[PDB]
Amino acid sequence: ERIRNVALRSKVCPAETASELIKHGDVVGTSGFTGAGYPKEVPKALAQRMEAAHDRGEKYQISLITGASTGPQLDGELAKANGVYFRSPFNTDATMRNRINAGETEYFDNHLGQVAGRAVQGNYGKFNIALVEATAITEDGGIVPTSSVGNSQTFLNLAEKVIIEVNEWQNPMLEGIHDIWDGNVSGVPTRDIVPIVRADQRVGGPVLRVNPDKIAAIVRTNDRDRNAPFAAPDETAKAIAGYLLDFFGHEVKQNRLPPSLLPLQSGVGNVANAVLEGLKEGPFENLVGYSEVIQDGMLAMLDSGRMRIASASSFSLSPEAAEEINNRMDFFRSKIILRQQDVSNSPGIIRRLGCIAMNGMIEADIYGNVNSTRVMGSKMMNGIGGSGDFARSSYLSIFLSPSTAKGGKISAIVPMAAHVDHIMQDAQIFVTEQGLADLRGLSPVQRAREIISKCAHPDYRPMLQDYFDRALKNSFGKHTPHLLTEALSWHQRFIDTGTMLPSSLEHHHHHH
Amino acid sequence: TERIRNVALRSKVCPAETASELIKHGDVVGTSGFTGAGYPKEVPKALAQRMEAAHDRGEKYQISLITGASTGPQLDGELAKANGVYFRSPFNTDATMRNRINAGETEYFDNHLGQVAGRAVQGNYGKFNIALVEATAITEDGGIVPTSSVGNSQTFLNLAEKVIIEVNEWQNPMLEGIHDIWDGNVSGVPTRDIVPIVRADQRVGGPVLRVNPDKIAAIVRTNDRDRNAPFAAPDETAKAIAGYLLDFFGHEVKQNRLPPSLLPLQSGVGNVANAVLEGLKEGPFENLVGYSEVIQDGMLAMLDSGRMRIASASSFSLSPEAAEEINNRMDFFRSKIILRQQDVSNSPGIIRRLGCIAMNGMIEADIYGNVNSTRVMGSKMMNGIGGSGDFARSSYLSIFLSPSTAKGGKISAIVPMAAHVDHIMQDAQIFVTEQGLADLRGLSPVQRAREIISKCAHPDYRPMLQDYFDRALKNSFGKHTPHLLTEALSWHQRFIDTGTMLPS
């Protein structure tokens, strides 16, 4: 039995009935972070009822605040139903992305570590509903989270009414892996000192806490998380990982990093996977993770002993890795700590531990300002996520990307970024399959010489050099040279023609 | 009274010219100095003269200059005149040095002020050859008493191979006691220490910079003045901005979103900040607390009137009139002011913990509320980002304040797209101009634009901004943050071409 508090068993009801508690206009806070631990059955039932209402000319939309990304059963179903008027802080569902980019869903991608605090401040309004997925409910009414913690404790505190989905698909032995603190991290100032001085340090307990009188419904479910396929490293990712690992090796030999490096933050996807595979094969020992996510390559390193501990707010695992950790949850439970995201993404803690931040990007300009979010400056991809939390607070901020996109028709290094998420001050190292730019100690013009020479693709470097050269001669000021007449012209060229590469039918200064 | 109270260290006293000879071509020099206060004065002058002579003989002679923040004509000015600085960080306001920077003659990088010490220890600027630090006094056990700022001086003393102290008799001996220098690991090798500050008036350290006396290569007796802030009063535009902000604070308190005493306050320097402080001085919020980078004129008034109880900062930025008052009454003001290391005053962990209210200026913001603090037309440096990022991102509330226009109406402070970004949308919640106040909390980018355009933009520019936004909504590549890339930067180019952002 998953509901070990007898009194709360009387609140069990079907998903459809529970969804009726959610009203048009409501602000709904849910569990869910990197496709893990989001509610599934109540959102599906809600979406059906939303569509039915819309067909009869009746409005039915919610504001949806999450930990971070969810999955098809939540963002997907609600976006299909056109049921979300406002969304925050981070989405990866393609249907929801389309609603955002059509202006049908208003969106703001907050720094992930800040969301709980802004919720408590009231920026999203009054929370009507918290809808949270659970592994179990304990004897004294504690709520055991599932494959992520995210913002769930904050949403439970704020919401007028609470709905719990108890998912028997989630492994019972997840109980104990979470660390939930009752301290003031995101409440009213003055906040508490968050006393974390080791990545493996627990400060709290294993359960979310909530007044049982606020629980309006409990729904028994049995459904899987998103679990994206493993993105196998291609040669581009492998080259990027190779330059990065060589760099780490050099930092260690110059005593600027310990042989155990520092606590590591990375993502998911191709490049991160290549980096984790390189770390598994590399000369470094006693590694530590202090990140947003646990991904596949870590289980390997936790099992071998290459990595000693991994701190995160969520799992981001493939189907095969998901089965590996479930068959051995009692081992991995001792190696992993899942934290509230306002703790995993706490700038104070990230700086104190001296994390190495490794993040992706859409593009960077020649001065090393970074766009993480908005294609051509206007079309949302996913969101800033925790990349700003980590980039700004880290001991070392590293951005990694293929040097081109769209089969070479887009350069990831541009004269000016069409949107900025990370300013120059927040980015010290850039890595592409072309090489690694170490920007420490450099002015913007010096940053440009390094980025253009080390990171840019051969197809675009002469164009970049031409822009920079002419900017140096003609720019209003020469501290960060620009030609405002063409700074964004590569982006407009892409919009117009589908490529940033110029045609020989017209003049271009780099052909000559 | 003898300023060098350690008898043994008196034997290290030498001329500024001889001391400057310790500094070699290529050296990385860390100095005191923050908001025109407490920078070294006589050794940089002597160095500059020797640099010029060297250059004339065909000898290379340049240094890297790392400071707390801004300095003055004796340091940034003289060295820039001599073409003696190959790299400068993190914050300059001297006109001669600014001209070197914008000519590409001095390399510059404006780091977040709270991060500079940590990056210095990491080695980003290279090995420190020299620390050149101004002192009020040297204590009997060899402690270095800082002057009108603390800045990064403790870190530079730790790092540098050789140390030069300027003991400046111009500086008030009664400054001794006002500083709080922490022994702990804020900016050193990870894992760092927990910084135990949980109230803005909490002292956690001692009154002196610590340095191994064997590293002290020279002590120079000096007698010269800091820079002062302007006396000039806030005009009608600044007073209007302050009025909107104070009305906003009132409503926040009435809605129980701020305490009646508000929260610890951070304020930049300028006319607008002065207006806000004058507003608060006779405002309805009592028992105020400052947790800022700087102590300015307005704070002294409030610390005097009791309307403000304590002010924490790293430096002074005072007018001649205000400087005279504090120096006449240092007894009193010393008990009301704490001067901290800048990596503590600007610690994002502390700023968030205390829940600071950040109030900063700007060059411009775009319609989505991204902020440019630094680079005119995107390429010409003004001063630098300073501590505005430390505070904007970490604060409980991040507010940006500016006149809606500049250059007699020929520049709009609200533009379609910022030509350079220092603060992203996520780091700016409230904008105030003399036209009104935009509260952006809870809003998507297109919702932010409606508020910024209608509340903050000047009437001369508002229809142009609305026209841009409306056509972007129709024709932009994506509709989440609509832009027309062909004209996004066109107002800036129009200014470059014609001298005004207004069409013919």
Contact across the interface for B379 and A262, Cβ inside 8 Å: no
A310 and A298 Cβ atoms separated by less than 8 Å: yes
Interface residue of A63, A384, A468, A479 to substitute, partner B, most B CBs within 10 Å: A479
Q: Tell me how far CA of residue B200 lies from CA of A379, B197, B285, B313, B350, in angstroms.
A: 42, 7, 17, 10, 9
List of residues 6+ apart from B455 with CB closer than 8 A = B431, B435, B436, B437, B438
A396 and A356 Cβ atoms separated by less than 8 Å: yes
Beta bridge partners of A385: none
Looking up tokens 């459904």 gives: A223
R_g of chain B, CA atoms, integer Å: 23
What angle do the packed helices B271-281 and B236-254 form, to 10 degrees?
A: 50
B172 and B179 Cβ atoms separated by less than 8 Å: no
A269 and A294 Cβ atoms separated by less than 8 Å: no
Q: Compute, in degrees rounded to 10, the torsion defined by CA atoms B212, B213, B219, B225.
A: 40
Q: How far apart are the first and last CA of chain B?
A: 67
Contact across the interface for A256 and B443, Cβ inside 8 Å: no
Contact across the interface for A418 and B375, Cβ inside 8 Å: no
Q: How far apart are the first and last CA of chain A?
A: 76
Q: Tell me how far CA of residue A185 lies from CA of A157, A342, B269, B333, in angstroms.
A: 13, 7, 31, 34
List of residues 6+ apart from B78 with CB closer than 8 A = B44, B45, B47, B48
Number of H helices, E strands in chain B: 17, 27
**Is A14's Cβ below 8 Å from some Cβ in B?**
no
For A55, the token pair is: 């067909």
ω into B31 cis (within 30 of 0): no
For A305, the token pair is: 């002993």
Residue count of chain B, please give it: 504
Beta bridge partners of A435: A432
ω into A212 cis (within 30 of 0): no
Instruction: Please name the amino acid found at residue B480.
Output: H
Strands (E) located in A113-208: 129-134, 136-137, 143-144, 161-167, 178-179
- In which element (H, E) is residue A280 found? helix A270-281
* 3-class DSSP string for B143-207: CEECCCECECHHHHHHHCCEEEEEEECCCCHHHCCCEEECCCCCCCCCCCCCCCCCCCCCCCCEC
- In A187-246, the residues whose Cβ lies within 8 Å of chain B are 188-193, 195, 197-198
Could you tell me if residue A466 is left (phi over 0), alpha (psi between -120 and 50 degrees) or otherwise beta?
A: alpha
List of residues 6+ apart from B156 with CB closer than 8 A = B30, B31, B32, B66, B120, B128, B131, B133
Q: Tell me how far CA of residue B24 lies from CA of A403, B28, B61, B120, in angstroms.
A: 41, 9, 7, 19
For A230, the token pair is: 């493993």
For A293, the token pair is: 């996510």
Q: Give the integer Cα–Cα distance in Å for A95 and A105.
A: 11
Contact across the interface for A443 and B393, Cβ inside 8 Å: no
A76 DSSP assignment: I
For B95, the token pair is: 């006109």
| Nearest CA among A77, A160, A69 for reference residue A115 | A69
Interface residue of B97, B101, B426, B430 to substitute, partner A, most A CBs within 10 Å: B426
| Nearest CA among B448, B409, B397, B450 for reference residue B425 | B448
- In which element (H, E) is residue B55 found? helix B42-56
Q: Compute, in degrees rounded to 10, the torsion defined by CA atoms B204, A348, A153, A202.
A: -80
Residue count of chain A, please give it: 512
Active-site residue, selected from the candidate residues B293, B364, B434, B451: B293
B418 and B365 Cβ atoms separated by less than 8 Å: yes
Instruction: Please name the amino acid found at residue B87.
Output: F
What are the chain B neighbours of A110 within 8 Å (beta carbons)?
Answer: 426
For B127, the token pair is: 């090995």
| Nearest CA among A239, A295, A244, A306 for reference residue A266 | A295
Q: Strand A370-371 relative to strand A404-405: parallel, antiparallel, unpaired?
A: unpaired
CA dihedral over B84, B87, B90, B92, signed as positive or negative: positive
Chain B: closest CA distance from residue A124 (Å): 5
Residue A257 exposed, middle or buried by CB count within 10 Å (0-12, 13-18, 19+)? buried
CA dihedral over A402, A239, A370, A391, signed as positive or negative: positive
Q: Give the integer Cα–Cα distance in Å for B56 and B82.
A: 11
Provide φ and ψ at A307, rounded to 5°: -110, 135
Angle formed at CA A263 by CA B345 and CA A328, multiple of 5 degrees: 140
CA dihedral over A61, A67, A68, A69, signed as positive or negative: negative
Provide φ and ψ at A364, rounded to 5°: -130, 150
B241 and B249 Cβ atoms separated by less than 8 Å: no
Give me the residue from B109, B380, B417 closest to A442, CB to CB. B109
Strands (E) located in B85-129: 85-89, 107-108
Instruction: Please name the amino acid found at residue A191.
Output: R
- In B247-276, the residues whose Cβ lies within 8 Å of chain A are 257, 263
List of residues 6+ apart from B299 with CB closer than 8 A = B277, B290, B308, B311
Angle formed at CA A176 by CA A174 and CA A181, multiple of 5 degrees: 120
Beta bridge partners of A62: A84
What are the chain B neighbours of A471 within 8 Å (beta carbons)?
Answer: 379
B93 DSSP assignment: -
Q: Tell me how far CA of residue B148 lies from CA of B39, B179, B314, B343, B405, in angstroms.
A: 9, 9, 9, 16, 34
Count CB neighbours of A324 within 10 A.
Answer: 17
* 3-class DSSP string for B272-336: HHHHHHHHHHCCCCCCEEEECCEEEHHHHHHHHHCCEEEEEECEEECCHHHHHHHHHCHHHHCCC
Q: Tell me how far CA of residue B188 lies from CA of A302, A490, B198, B343, in angstroms.
A: 29, 43, 21, 11
Residue B407 exposed, middle or buried by CB count within 10 Å (0-12, 13-18, 19+)? exposed
Q: Give the integer Cα–Cα distance in Å for A234 and A244.
A: 15
Q: Give the integer Cα–Cα distance in Å for A42 and A164.
A: 9
Count CB neighbours of A340 within 10 A.
Answer: 28
Give me the residue from B103, B104, B124 closest to A440, CB to CB. B124
Q: Give the integer Cα–Cα distance in Å for B501 and B504.
A: 9
Q: Give the integer Cα–Cα distance in Å for A294 and A443.
A: 36
Q: Give the integer Cα–Cα distance in Å for A432 and A274.
A: 13
For B90, the token pair is: 């993190």
R_g of chain A, CA atoms, integer Å: 24
Q: Give the integer Cα–Cα distance in Å for A168 and A166.
A: 6
List of residues 6+ apart from B394 with CB closer than 8 A = A347, B348, B349, B351, B352, B356, B358
Q: Give the integer Cα–Cα distance in Å for A244 and A278.
A: 9
Give me the residue from A103, A354, A472 closest to B446, CB to CB. A103
Burial A434-449 (b: 16+ CB within 10 A, else e): bbbbebebbbbbebbe
Q: Is B293 a catalytic residue?
A: yes
Q: Give the integer Cα–Cα distance in Å for A346 and B182.
A: 23
A99 and A79 Cβ atoms separated by less than 8 Å: yes
Active-site residue, selected from the candidate residues A41, A165, A292, A450: A292
What angle do the packed helices A296-304 and A270-281 form, to 10 degrees?
A: 10
DSSP states of B395-457:
SSEEEEE--SEETTTTEESEESS-SS-SB-GGG--EEEETTEEEE-TT--HHHHHHHHHHHHS
**Is A364's Cβ below 8 Å from some Cβ in B?**
no
Instruction: Please name the amino acid found at residue B3.
Output: R
Burial B91-116 (b: 16+ CB within 10 A, else e): bbbbebbbebbbebebbbbbbbbbbb
Give me the residue from A446, A481, A488 closest to B485, CB to CB. A488
| Nearest CA among B179, B119, B175, B192 for reference residue B151 | B179
What angle do the packed helices B297-305 and B320-328 form, to 10 degrees?
A: 40
Instruction: Please name the amino acid found at residue B446.
Output: V
**Scanning every residue of chain A, which has its alpha carbon at the shortest distance from the alpha carbon of B422?**
A423
Contact across the interface for A477 and B107, Cβ inside 8 Å: no
Instruction: Please name the amino acid found at residue B295.
Output: I
A243 and A431 Cβ atoms separated by less than 8 Å: yes
Count CB neighbours of A469 within 10 A.
Answer: 13
List of residues 6+ apart from A60 with CB closer than 8 A = A24, A49, A50, A53, A54, A83
Q: Give the integer Cα–Cα distance in Å for B37 and A446.
A: 30
ω into A190 cis (within 30 of 0): yes
Residue B487 exposed, middle or buried by CB count within 10 Å (0-12, 13-18, 19+)? middle
Provide φ and ψ at A161, rounded to 5°: -130, 150
What angle do the packed helices A461-474 and A444-454 form, to 10 degrees?
A: 160
- In which element (H, E) is residue B365 found? strand B364-366
Give alpha helix (H) positions in A104-151. 115-121
Q: Compute, in degrees rounded to 10, the torsion defined by CA atoms A361, A365, A371, A374.
A: -110
B81 and B99 Cβ atoms separated by less than 8 Å: no
What are the chain B neighbours of A442 within 8 Å (beta carbons)?
Answer: 107, 109
Q: Compute, in degrees rounded to 10, the torsion defined by CA atoms B120, B124, B128, B131.
A: -40
Q: Give the integer Cα–Cα distance in Å for B421 and B371.
A: 6
- In which element (H, E) is residue A65 found? strand A62-65
**Is B474's Cβ below 8 Å from some Cβ in A?**
no
Strands (E) located in A191-335: 215-221, 264-265, 287-290, 293-295, 307-312, 314-316
B403 and B271 Cβ atoms separated by less than 8 Å: no
Could you tell me if residue A232 is left (phi over 0), alpha (psi between -120 and 50 degrees) or otherwise beta?
A: beta
Q: Compute, in degrees rounded to 10, the torsion defined by CA atoms B346, B348, B349, B350.
A: 40
| Nearest CA among B244, B258, B218, B281 for reference residue B436 | B244
Q: Give the integer Cα–Cα distance in Å for A79 and B477.
A: 21
Residue A172 exposed, middle or buried by CB count within 10 Å (0-12, 13-18, 19+)? exposed
Give the largest CA-CA distance in chain A: 80
Give the largest CA-CA distance in chain B: 77
Q: Give the integer Cα–Cα distance in Å for A431 and A408.
A: 17
What are the chain B neighbours of A348 within 8 Å (beta carbons)?
Answer: 348-349, 352-353
Structure solved via = X-ray
Q: Is A488 helix (H, G, I), strand (E, B) or coil?
A: coil
Count CB neighbours of A174 within 10 A.
Answer: 25
Q: Give the integer Cα–Cα distance in Å for A199 and A202.
A: 9
Contact across the interface for A108 and B445, Cβ inside 8 Å: yes
Count CB neighbours of B227 within 10 A.
Answer: 19
| Nearest CA among B268, B244, B213, B261 for reference residue B4 | B213
Chain B: closest CA distance from residue A302 (Å): 22
Contact across the interface for B426 and A479, Cβ inside 8 Å: no
**Is A420's Cβ below 8 Å from some Cβ in B?**
yes
Give me the residue from A121, A351, A480 closest to B349, CB to CB. A351
| Nearest CA among A422, A336, A403, A321 for reference residue A149 | A336
What are the chain B neighbours of A487 within 8 Å (beta carbons)?
Answer: 378, 489
| Nearest CA among A134, A129, A154, A155 for reference residue A22 | A129
Looking up tokens 């105030």 gives: B432
Instruction: Please name the amino acid found at residue A197.
Output: V
Q: Strand A178-179 relative to strand A429-432: parallel, antiparallel, unpaired?
A: unpaired
List the domain boundaries for chain A.
1-512
